[PDB]
Amino acid sequence: ARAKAKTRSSRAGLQFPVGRVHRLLRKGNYSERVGAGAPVYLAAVLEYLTAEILELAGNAARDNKKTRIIPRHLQLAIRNDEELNKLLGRVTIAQGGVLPNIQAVLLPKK
């Protein structure tokens, strides 16, 4: 019969899905039994990290004054904040350049 048929992501108020995340935990072979409470913690923990990268990425684009986030902005946001430079410290963003730094000895002093 059924009735409301409301979604799990809607009940917990998290934009990232909490239905796809449970299937992937079950069929990746991480462990035999996945408790229902666990997928919901993962969808929230992943959401906070995406909101930190996208919000910081947007500010850097505004300074350049272009109105679209592009690969070069994401390298400048990820490689400036201290905490996000120690989780993603090995990953190399494609088409991302390097942050601008020149050592003083090379720079003509006088």
């Binding site: 996208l54 690969p71 993603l88």
Partner: protein, 98 residues
Amino acid sequence: KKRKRSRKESYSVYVYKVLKQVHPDTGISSKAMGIMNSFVNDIFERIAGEASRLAHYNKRSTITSREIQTAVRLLLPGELAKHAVSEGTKAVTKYTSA
């Protein structure tokens, strides 16, 4: 056409909604979706991965909520940990009520 392509799954629809909430007037190019969609699929293998081992050492056979809170206190740095362990419990609390 007549191919009946299997097709693929992407967390690309979801990323767009989050971009709108934090900033309401910018947009993301397709190359930028590619870097972002990979990150959401690489912080789902480290955080889930430490949970699998933490279950075996203890001898317990299920990956429940505590085991994804001892894997966010180990694989995430310093102050992006206190602000993410706290954020997650609030969504678990709401789900239990409804």
